Amino acid sequence: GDVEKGKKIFIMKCSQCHTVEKGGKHKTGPNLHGLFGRKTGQAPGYSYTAANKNKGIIWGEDTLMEYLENPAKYIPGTKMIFVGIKKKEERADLIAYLKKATNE
Ligand code: HEC
């Protein structure tokens, strides 16, 4: 994925509710640092829905590709109220950005 395009997508579509950096604040949604390889619903200090806590899968490229296409379809009961990103290439770019930013 194209990390520079992904950053712009993150800013436009996600930053209102999320931070990615180490020690970043929680906002409407949880800080996303350390996301990859973690089970759903595990950011310290954030109050998740039971649905997000119980989904029970590991975040990675594939599971994010599916989640970000339609969040509430993947996690029914989620409080993340966001339509999703329809185009596969846009999801791949965003995910490439997340994979970098949430791990440095
Ligand atoms: C822009 C496309 C994004 C991306 C990449 C993510 N979000 Fe959100 N998000 C929001 C809230 C309230 C939650 C918690 C939901 C709940 O407890 O039910 C989330 C959760 C996520 C996750 C899961 C994190 C985990 O630790 O399991 C992920 C990967 C994620 N988001 C990515 C709120 C919002 C928004 C507020 C209106 C918006 C916009 C977004 N999220 C957008 C995005």
From Swiss-Prot:
Its main location: mitochondrion. Heme c binds at C14, C17, H18, M80. The modification N6-acetyllysine is found at A72, K99. Pfam families: Cytochrom_C. This is Cytochrome c. The keyword Cytoplasm does not apply. It comes from Homo sapiens (Human). Keywords: Acetylation, Apoptosis, Disease variant, Electron transport, Heme, Iron, Metal-binding, Mitochondrion, Phosphoprotein, Respiratory chain, Transport. InterPro entries: Cyt_c-like_dom, Cyt_c-like_dom_sf, Cyt_c_1A/1B. GO terms for molecular function: electron transfer activity; heme binding; metal ion binding. GO terms for cellular component: apoptosome; cytosol; mitochondrial inner membrane; mitochondrial intermembrane space; mitochondrion; nucleus. GO terms for biological process: apoptotic signaling pathway; cellular respiration; execution phase of apoptosis; intrinsic apoptotic signaling pathway; mitochondrial electron transport, cytochrome c to oxygen; mitochondrial electron transport, ubiquinol to cytochrome c. Belongs to the cytochrome c family. Signal peptide: none annotated. The modification N-acetylglycine is found at G1. Electron carrier protein. The oxidized form of the cytochrome c heme group can accept an electron from the heme group of the cytochrome c1 subunit of cytochrome reductase. Cytochrome c then transfers this electron to the cytochrome oxidase complex, the final protein carrier in the mitochondrial electron-transport chain. Plays a role in apoptosis. Suppression of the anti-apoptotic members or activation of the pro-apoptotic members of the Bcl-2 family leads to altered mitochondrial membrane permeability resulting in release of cytochrome c into the cytosol. Binding of cytochrome c to Apaf-1 triggers the activation of caspase-9, which then accelerates apoptosis by activating other caspases. It is linked to Thrombocytopenia 4: A form of thrombocytopenia, a hematologic disorder defined by a decrease in the number of platelets in circulating blood, resulting in the potential for increased bleeding and decreased ability for clotting. It is found in: Mitochondrion intermembrane space. The modification Phosphotyrosine is found at Y48, Y97. Binds 1 heme c group covalently per subunit. The keyword Lyase does not apply. The modification N6-succinyllysine is found at K55, A72.
